[PDB]
Amino acid sequence: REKKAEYFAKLREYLEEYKSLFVVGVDNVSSQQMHEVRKELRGRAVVLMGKNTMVRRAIRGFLSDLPDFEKLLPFVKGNVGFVFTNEPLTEIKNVIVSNRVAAPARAGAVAPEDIWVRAVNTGMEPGKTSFFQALGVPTKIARGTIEIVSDVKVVDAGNKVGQSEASLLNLLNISPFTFGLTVVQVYDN
Amino acid sequence: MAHFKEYQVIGRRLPTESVPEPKLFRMRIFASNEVIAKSRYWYFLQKLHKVKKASGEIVSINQINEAHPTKVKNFGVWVRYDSRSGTHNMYKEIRDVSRVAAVETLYQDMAARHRARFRSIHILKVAEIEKTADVKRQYVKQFLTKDLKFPLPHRVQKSTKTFSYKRPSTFY
Amino acid sequence: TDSIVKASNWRLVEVGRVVLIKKGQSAGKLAAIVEIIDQKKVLIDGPKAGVPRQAINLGQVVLTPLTFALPRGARTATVSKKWAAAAVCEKWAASSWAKKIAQRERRAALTDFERFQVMVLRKQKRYTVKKALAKA
Amino acid sequence: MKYIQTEQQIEVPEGVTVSIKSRIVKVVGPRGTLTKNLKHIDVTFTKVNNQLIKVAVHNGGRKHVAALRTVKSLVDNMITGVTKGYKYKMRYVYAHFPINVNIVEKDGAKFIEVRNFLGDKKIRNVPVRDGVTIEFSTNVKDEIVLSGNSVEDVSQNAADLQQICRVRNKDIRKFLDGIYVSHKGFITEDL
RNA sequence: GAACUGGCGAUGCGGGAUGAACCGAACGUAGAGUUAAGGUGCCGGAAUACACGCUCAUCAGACACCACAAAAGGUGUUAGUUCAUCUAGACAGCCGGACGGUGGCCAUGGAAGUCGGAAUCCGCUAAGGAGUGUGUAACAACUCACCGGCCGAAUGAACUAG
């Protein structure tokens, strides 16, 4: 026993006094969205959707790691992760204020509503946006006063995204789709 | 050639007036007749030591006999042979009844799976393995367990006569 | 409400099953399988029948449905004693195969006078059978 | 090499049962009956005691032994189907031209019509075979569900439909409007 | 063109769609057993026996000189060579790793992980990277790496030739 102590006989043994519970599942989301918000108070969060080393655990049986884990006891198949966090949830709405410049999401996912935001002039040259033959964007300009000739809806929810349609369209510095709740349980003993 | 035999051979490399009593070399070789046996022994001696048939003698030949022909035996075999691109060094094992039948099966197996005619094979050793849990290959490790119950279905059988009324079956 | 399967039971090769040969030096003498090498080659024994101990290919041998308990790797002194103890000949000759063999042998061996006897007796049997079959 | 004797266990519950001819197999259970012909490789079956059927083969190569577990999969899957039912949920997706699907009986045939698929205007027909039914899924938008006992018939029908709803001569990754499976399960749950 | 022997227009043919030159072989009339450098189910005179292998080939393959194949390759099938793990029980049933450098340089009102050029380590030591690709011509940059939940046995990698 040389390296295993640094995980079992070190971290868990020095923090075998936790009674919090934050069970989350990354089914299909931008991983860093949940990761940075689990962090920010960095150094107290690490995903550990584990593996099957419980035969060895029972061989060395003297853990008593989480007695509050008796709820999904017939779920020995892709179990949730033994992650240790004891953070508060009354911090984001008072301590941190006026961020407003975070990074957008993957840029490409499906939006909830069909919205066309009005574009303001900036004084730049046209870029590499000569790929729109399929559906396109019929528009007309007349010194700022823009006029759309026909509307197009591209896709609904429940379908994967294209490849080269996220270059110079969303130039407002807005995250297109984070806006959701993904969590299995949030308890304290 | 025919069904194999095998002999022990002893040569001497005839003496000299200044250096009498040579060292007396022995080998044991597999063949079909005493003549080709001694010829192939001389061939191996040519290859492995400096001596010539015009400068030697065969001091003894003996057609040995295997001891216990009743006991089925597990024989490991080492061989070095040449092929259409290069040479190799192979090792196998066979469950058989005697060493002559072992080598007879080995030559057919090599001619099957490597096209190694008799003119390109020479055996290094054939030894016995006596205990269990020492075989290696899963085409001979089967028949060691207890109770080898199995049929061999589809019992075909020919007919000396050319015609037949009953339209036979193949039960067994 | 049953899960029926027929039988799927055919005759096997196994230490103890007496066998019969068809072509070779001995030619038609029972023998007892004692050991097994691989799919084709084994060694058999039949000392009371007078065959030596040797190895024969299974294609050269015919099987039988009789058998009895044997230990592996035995030899003549044991297999002959077990053969005599089981007394296979008490039931083999009683079986409906050696009787047909003896029938073949006698029918091939008998001569002209016996043939004429069999002819007249076959006329007798035909008469007797057809008598009872005609009326009823 | 040359596995002289290799077998595989297969279980059967008490409610159902099976009868094997020389080469034909016939399962019967509460949901119904089923039959199948195995004149393909000829491997042996051996009963043990009303619950355990051993499939077996003797002397063969890997090509000859693979068929053993193949027929094990066939038989245990089909008995699972006849004792538990199978179902396939497929979905519709459309970009701008919504689909119009319907079921139409005529001469005891029961075909399915598809319309407004990328603007076509003459019928896209597809038939259905016995032992399987379909109902348009209520309280949910743009789905269909096949449900049956066997698996080969229903999977083939679903594949036939999802292959018929194909398009050519357009962009190869922009157009993704058609029909495709989504869920594969049983008519019952955990039984 | 030529040396060596056995062959030649003028030199007698088994094998094949013929015979100088594909092996060159020496010749009585009725007169033995085998073959000249032979194959046998039928082109028929003769054994549809014996032991292991490829063989599905949706262009199979078939007997010397003779009437044919190699770029480059095959978890298609058999047989081997070598190297590392296993009853101190690992594989195939899902995850992520962004502390300082990542705000690193081009005539002092603006350049946040190399458009025009050098460089990829440390204290850290189960997480803990200046990155194969990287939104206005960087300021707002996401995916992935010895670690971690039941059962229970052979598996993994690289080569060799039929």
Q: Which residues of C86-116 are buried (b: 16+ CB within 10 A; e: fewer)?
A: bebeeeeeeeeeeeeeeeeeeeeeeeeeeee
Residue in chain C lying closest to B147 (CA)? C14
DSSP string, D120-157: --S-EEE---TTEEEEEPTTSSSEEEEEES-SHHHHHH
When CB atoms are compared, the residue of B72, B140, B149 closest to C12 is: B149
- DSSP H or E segment with residue B27: strand B25-31
**Can you give the length of chain D in residues?**
191
CATH of the domain at C37: 2.30.30.30
Query: Residue D32: left (phi > 0), alpha (psi -120 to 50), or beta?
Result: left
- Mapping DSSP onto H, E and C, the string for chain C reads CCCCCCCCCCCCECCCCEEEECCCCCCCCCEEEEEECCCCEEEEEECCCCEEEEEEEHHHEEECCCCCCCCCCCCHHHHHHHHHHHCCHHHHCCCCCHHHHHHHHHHHHCCHHHHHHHHHHHHHHHHHHHHHHHHC
The distance of A151 to chain D (nearest Cα, Å) reads 11
The distance of B2 to chain C (nearest Cα, Å) reads 18
Positions 104-133 of A with beta carbon below 7 A from strand E are 104, 106-107, 122, 124-125, 127
Contact D13, D37 (CB under 8 A): no
B–C CB contacts, 8 A cutoff, strictly below: 43
Angle at D37 between CA D32 and CA D39, to 5 degrees: 165
- DSSP H or E segment with residue B81: strand B73-82
Which residue carries 């528009």 as its tokens?
A139
| Gyration radius from chain D CA atoms | 21
User: Who contacts A65 (Cβ-Cβ below 8 Å, separation ≥6)?
Assistant: A12, A16, A82
Beta bridge partners, D27, equal: D18, D34
CATH node for D1-85: 3.90.930.12
* Contact at CB, A134 and D176, closer than 8 angstroms: no
The SS3 of residue B47 is helix
Closest-CA residue to A42 (of A50, A51, A32, A29) = A32
* Contact at CB, C3 and D22, closer than 8 angstroms: no
Look up residue D75 and give its two tokens.
Answer: 């038989």
User: Who contacts A164 (Cβ-Cβ below 8 Å, separation ≥6)?
Assistant: A131
The SS3 of residue A15 is coil
D86-191 to CATH, choices 3.40.50.300, 3.90.930.12, 3.90.1150.10, 3.90.76.10 = 3.90.930.12
Residue in chain D lying closest to B150 (CA)? D5
Domain interval for residue C32 = 12-94
Query: Which residues of A fall within a CB distance of 8 Å from D89?
Result: none
The experimental method is cryo-EM
Contacting chains of B (3 CB pairs or more, <8 Å) are C, D
Distance, CA of D161 to CA of D166 (rounded, Å): 9
Look up residue A105 and give its two tokens.
Answer: 């999401």
CATH node for B70-146: 3.10.20.10
Top CATH class, B3-69: alpha beta
Sheet containing B73-82: which strands, arranged edge to edge? Answer: B87-96, B73-82, B121-129
Contact D86, D24 (CB under 8 A): no
Resolution in angstroms comes to 4.2
Long-range contacts made by residues C38-43, C-beta under 8 angstroms, separation at least 24?
Answer: C38/B95, C38/B140, C38/B143, C39/B152, C39/D2, C39/D4, C39/D59, C41/B96, C41/B97, C42/C13, C43/B70, C43/B72, C43/B97
Report the amino acid identity of residue A56. Answer: R
Sheet containing B25-31: which strands, arranged edge to edge? Answer: B25-31, B5-11, B58-62
The SS3 of residue B59 is strand
Contact A107, A170 (CB under 8 A): yes
Per DSSP, which regions of chain D are E strands? Answer: 6-11, 17-20, 24-28, 33-37, 44-47, 52-57, 86-93, 100-104, 111-115, 124-126, 132-136, 143-148, 178-185
Longest dimension (CA), chain B: 86
- DSSP H or E segment with residue B44: helix B34-48
| Whole-number distance in Å between D163 CA and E155 C1' | 40
Count CA within 13 A, CB hemisphere, residue C65. Answer: 7
| Domain boundaries defined on chain B | 3-69, 70-146
Substitution target in B136, B141, B142, B144 with the highest count of D β-carbons within 10 Å is B142
| Whole-number distance in Å between B162 CA and E43 C1' | 24
- D1-85 and D86-191: identical CATH topology: yes
